[PDB]
């Protein structure tokens, strides 16, 4: 019982683990009346 890691994992291998960890920016559309930006299919912070 009680499993443990056998080797400190390397700076190479943990960083490669993280290759998927990167964020993707919010999805945004120009607003119908106001100048500003909005997520699509939502109610605009300005001029709802």
């Amino acid at each position: 019982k009680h499993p443990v890691p056998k080797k400190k994992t390397s700076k190479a291998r943990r960083d490669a683990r993280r290759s998927h960890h990167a964020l993707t920016p919010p999805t945004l559309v120009p607003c119908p009346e106001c100048k500003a930006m909005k997520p699509p299919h939502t109610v605009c912070p300005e001029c709802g």
Binding site: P26, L28, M37
Partner: protein, 112 residues
Amino acid sequence: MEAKAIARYVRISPRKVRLVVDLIRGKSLEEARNILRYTNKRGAYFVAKVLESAAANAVNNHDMLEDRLYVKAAYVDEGPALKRVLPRARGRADIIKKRTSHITVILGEKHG
């Protein structure tokens, strides 16, 4: 000419806040402005503050002409970590570290 802001000893984890910083790098100040607002991370707040101070500092200090601002380079280094004791089973007591980020946004002028 180029202008910066550095938020220091921000109580938040460098690993965590670095992620949103990556979202806005090389972005025109205006897309960077839109990206952080709709990003959902506790660190979008803190970066947006540093973004602005540098935007302020740019126009307001180094006479940089706002409309052409982009994010030249930017990054968070790791500040000094405060340690606290987390009591555990059978008397044991580990220590967890609440960390610290030094956020840096560096602004420069677009060439158009």
